[PDB]
Amino acid sequence: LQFHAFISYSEHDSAWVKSELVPYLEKEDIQICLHERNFVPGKSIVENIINCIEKSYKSIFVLSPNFVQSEWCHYELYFAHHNLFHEGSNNLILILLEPIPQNSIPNKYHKLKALMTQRTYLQWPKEKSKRGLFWANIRAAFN
Amino acid sequence: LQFHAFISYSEHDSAWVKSELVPYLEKEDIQICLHERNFVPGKSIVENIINCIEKSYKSIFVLSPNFVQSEWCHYELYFAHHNLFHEGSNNLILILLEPIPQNSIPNKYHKLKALMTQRTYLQWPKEKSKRGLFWANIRAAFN
């Protein structure tokens, strides 16, 4: 493994990932694989994603409605049968950054709906005093 | 019809579309639909796209490696069987903005690989003297 964490996210959520999640992980010596730094052309998105997933200890998915509408398609098409998304896998971390009503999810995304039904996700809290508890679950997932 | 043209493109190619393609079309009284920019709220990505396609005379796809890696998945998954992508379709216009080698395209993108195989696309030239034949081909598609 080359990375402690792969982070998969939508550009719509860029700010939150780059000001909160990424510096929090970097402060704790958690090296991150990202599409901006690691992706290479001459390779498909599928291959870059596969590289990050295979070289990383954990894979973090930053779930939001925007993530559903722009990023999930690749995972449904190519990664539905992947060990990462099999129930009882120690390496998946799902972060629900903003709520996703189940009926907002396109009906061909069968794996995404199966995962949301599982309810293993870590929810980002509206209340700023209950953050820290979020981070406690994150550090439990790693450290 | 409300629109003469739908334009599907990647944001990575925004510049070329907004400084070159769109003004060229607008100048000649062509009403343009965009699923993000001719916004409809209350809809998923799929519903916006199919909306634009059904309401427009032609559908223009601005093909680039970036388009393949960020936009095509939705079309393979939800629209592969649509009449728009049926061979011998008067209504599809493919613009090749930047080259896409066959091996960079994921093998599950069957419809895209078939379309690229037809080689009916309009290629954007590096040399500025072969433009104009390019633009003349565009206006040809539209009168």
Swiss-Prot record, chains A, B:
Lineage: Eukaryota, Metazoa, Chordata, Craniata, Vertebrata
Protein name: Toll-like receptor 6
Tissue expression profile of the protein: Detected in monocytes, CD11c+ immature dendritic cells, plasmacytoid pre-dendritic cells and dermal microvessel endothelial cells.
Recorded family membership: Belongs to the Toll-like receptor family.
Organism: Homo sapiens
Assembly, per entry: Homodimer (via cytoplasmic TIR domain). Heterodimer with TLR2 via their respective extracellular domains. Binds MYD88 via their respective TIR domains. Interacts with CD36, following CD36 stimulation by oxLDL or amyloid-beta 42, and forms a heterodimer with TLR4. The trimeric complex is internalized and triggers inflammatory response. LYN kinase activity facilitates TLR4:TLR6 heterodimerization and signal initiation. The heterodimer TLR2:TLR6 interacts with CD14 and CD36 in response to triacylated lipopeptides.
Residues on Cytoplasmic side: 1-143
Outcome of substituting residue 73 to R: Inhibits homodimer formation
Domain called TIR: residue spans: 1-142
Function as written in the Swiss-Prot or TrEMBL entry: Participates in the innate immune response to Gram-positive bacteria and fungi. Specifically recognizes diacylated and, to a lesser extent, triacylated lipopeptides. In response to diacylated lipopeptides, forms the activation cluster TLR2:TLR6:CD14:CD36, this cluster triggers signaling from the cell surface and subsequently is targeted to the Golgi in a lipid-raft dependent pathway. Acts via MYD88 and TRAF6, leading to NF-kappa-B activation, cytokine secretion and the inflammatory response.
Subcellular location: Cell membrane; Cytoplasmic vesicle, Phagosome membrane; Membrane raft; Golgi apparatus
The organism's place on the tree of life at top rank: Eukaryota
